[PDB]
Scaffold this active site. Structure first.
Site, PDB file in Angstrom:
ATOM      1  N   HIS C 269       0.823  -1.197   0.000  1.00 32.00           N
ATOM      2  CA  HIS C 269       0.000   0.000   0.000  1.00 32.00           C
ATOM      3  C   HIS C 269       0.857   1.246   0.000  1.00 32.00           C
ATOM      4  O   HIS C 269       1.960   1.261   0.549  1.00 32.00           O
ATOM      5  CB  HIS C 269      -0.977   0.023   1.201  1.00 32.00           C
ATOM      6  CG  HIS C 269      -0.360   0.415   2.503  1.00 32.00           C
ATOM      7  ND1 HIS C 269      -0.119   1.727   2.848  1.00 32.00           N
ATOM      8  CD2 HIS C 269       0.016  -0.339   3.575  1.00 32.00           C
ATOM      9  CE1 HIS C 269       0.397   1.768   4.074  1.00 32.00           C
ATOM     10  NE2 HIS C 269       0.494   0.529   4.533  1.00 32.00           N
ATOM     11  N   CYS C 270       0.329   2.293  -0.631  1.00 32.32           N
ATOM     12  CA  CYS C 270       0.814   3.652  -0.428  1.00 32.32           C
ATOM     13  C   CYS C 270      -0.376   4.404   0.139  1.00 32.32           C
ATOM     14  O   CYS C 270      -1.145   3.811   0.894  1.00 32.32           O
ATOM     15  CB  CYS C 270       1.365   4.265  -1.731  1.00 32.32           C
ATOM     16  SG  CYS C 270       0.378   3.915  -3.212  1.00 32.32           S
TER      17      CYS C 270
END
Ligand SMILES: [Zn+2]
Ligand SMILES: [Zn+2]
Lengths: 11, 367, 357, 10
Positions: C269-270
């Protein structure tokens, strides 16, 4: 060639 | 104006009009669509080549430098055709890449998401199109070729470029410092031995031979059936090699590996390789394109775009999908093959590509 | 017949009309523009994703199978906009690739040189577009992904796909058997407090063999919640909108290779699970399967619209040779690295040579 | 797709 080139720098 | 793309605010615009616009106090318009023509083979329509680009740059600079335009924006334009708009946009981008040192993302931002879109470029062959390259491909390919030293518009000779493209002077292009692509010479070669010193070669054949003799061509590769006697190249010390495969087909990878090794062998001696098929477009583009990808890491689309920027029409029909599907292989070979230490009769005593394991073995005396 | 592209003679046509065509005794027309919509982040407009394609297939088959249409050609159509036309054509091509086993050159031949042309696809970011992928790129990317076993409509779970895309359920997509891309969870960790999307992510990860979570953005939650369910948590953070240093990418690829060798999934994830996440997963897909950069972007967006943003597209494009050829110029280290929590990084051929003597 | 029609490439 293209010492006649005007300067058209990227924005 | 409204039907107009900005490249440099207040200085360079790209328009499309089905009428002739009138210059204003603030705007000077010009087109080359009615003076610099793409010479289509079949239904290909572009991109414009490096010679056209040189001519465009001369015209553009004359307008830029005319004092009357000192406080005017220049609007380069075409008609409203999606094909002619693509040629104009691609040529202006190639100008910015090659004369003004812009990078691909800089020349592509003004063009992105234009409505209506530009027509993608198709091949020069006779089947229905099934593969397209974009201005993005051509721009990246021309930029990469410039970055690798394969193009230099500042030493480009327009007179030589346009002369040798003509059928009557040999229909060839120097593609890179290593390669020439040309159409097959043709002759009626006398079948018996004759003691005569007189020449029976036509003007384009003599033109090819003289240029090759003066430009360090050391190997001619023939990819089509025999239309001339190879002795005419051998007479002037140029090695001649057949790697023939059928018109409109894609070469077996064994042919490609032999070609890449043969070309590497010559390049390592400092010589040029001149490659022809019948037209010097499809089959010739498969093999030179594979070598360019192997050497410089072009994508297949970039490679096709670059080749066509120098020599319109290269890589035909199914050869496009073939180059696209094998581009990883060609790059792979830098790591998985070596130039053979043993010559192969299949390429006239030049050295083919062989596997690392074969290479390791060739350095020993088999017991 | 006018403004109409033949896919299968007397059988399947692709039209673009600003009027409503009338069915005849030989022709049945349908459009899905009122039923299957692309949800734009900004000025992205397509391509349609795998769930859309699955629902198109259901509709298409229902019309094909209607007894009244037994002796009719089916005309699938859109409105005349170049964006709507691009979405319709790309979806019909993806249908032929994934359901009917056509190859790319077979689905592209009907579309080539159509006038007016289709609008090329742009990214989901806010800067002016400067990179485009085409139907040709998407088709080749989806075809290659299918050939590598990364897409399988037989096992595809439409309900699961559509549910977990929703923000309230964690905004994630399973991209491949090895990878999940998701938006960062958020919480207020006390100084039973987890929100519904975070619990949904934790539950799914626990049930679906996620063994590593890689965080690429600034902290918005306490990583202990992933370690509480036995999942290794790794920061490889780089700034929003930027491209990762190749040192990060090599660490990421080695971490992922280490987990995949164990049979586990990696969830990345970002902030949004689109740009930075697309850089790293994209690099790994190119390294592993040999996609072109444009194909990789097209495949990623076919599963999770909006992945790889702005300059990251040119970055992936310019480094694709690097990633592919790391199979030859790098090795997985024999020694674990603290920078990736004891997993094994990619290292150069020469260091691996030292280690192996 | 169970009863998926056959639409083979041409
Ligand atoms: Zn002769
Ligand atoms: Zn908490």
């Amino acid at each position: 060639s293209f010492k006649n080139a005007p300067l058209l720098a990227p924005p | 104006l409204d039907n107009t793309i900005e490249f440099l605010r207040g200085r360079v615009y790209l328009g499309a009009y089905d009428y002739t616009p009138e210059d204003t106090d603030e705007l000077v318009f010009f087109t080359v669509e009615d003076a610099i023509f793409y010479n289509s083979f079949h239904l290909d329509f572009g991109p414009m080549n490096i010679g056209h680009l040189y001519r465009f740059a001369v015209i553009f600079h004359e307008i830029l430098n005319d004092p009357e335009n000192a406080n005017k924006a220049v609007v380069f334009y075409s008609s409203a055709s999606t094909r002619q708009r693509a040629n104009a946009a691609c040529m202006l981008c190639c100008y910015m890449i090659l004369v003004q040192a812009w990078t691909p993302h800089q020349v592509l931002q003004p063009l992105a998401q234009v409505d209506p879109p530009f027509m993608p470029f198709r091949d020069a062959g006779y089947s229905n199109a099934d593969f397209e390259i974009t201005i993005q491909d051509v721009v990246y390919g021309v930029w990469r070729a410039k970055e690798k030293g394969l193009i230099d518009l500042h030493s480009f000779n327009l007179e030589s470029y346009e002369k040798y493209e003509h059928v009557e002077f040999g229909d060839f292009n120097v593609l890179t410092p290593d390669f020439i692509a040309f159409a097959s010479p043709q002759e009626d070669h006398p079948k018996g031995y004759l003691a005569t010193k007189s020449s029976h070669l036509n003007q384009p054949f003599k033109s090819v031979l003289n240029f090759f003799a003066n430009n360090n061509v050391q190997l001619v590769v023939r990819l089509n059936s025999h239309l001339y006697n190879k002795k005419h190249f051998e007479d002037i010390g140029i090695q001649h090699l057949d790697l023939i495969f059928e018109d409109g087909t894609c070469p077996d990878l064994s042919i490609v590996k032999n070609f890449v090794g043969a070309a590497e062998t010559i390049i390592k001696r400092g010589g040029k390789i001149a490659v022809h098929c019948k037209a010097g477009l499809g089959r010739t583009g498969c093999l030179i394109g594979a070598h360019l990808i192997y050497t410089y890491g072009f994508t297949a689309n970039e490679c096709i775009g670059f080749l066509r920027f120098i020599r319109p029409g290269m890589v035909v029909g199914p050869q496009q999908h073939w180059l696209y599907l094998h581009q990883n292989d060609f790059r792979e070979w830098k790591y998985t093959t070596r130039i053979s230490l043993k010559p192969s009769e299949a390429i006239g005593g030049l050295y083919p590509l062989i596997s690392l394991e074969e290479y390791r073995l060739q350095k020993k005396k088999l017991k």
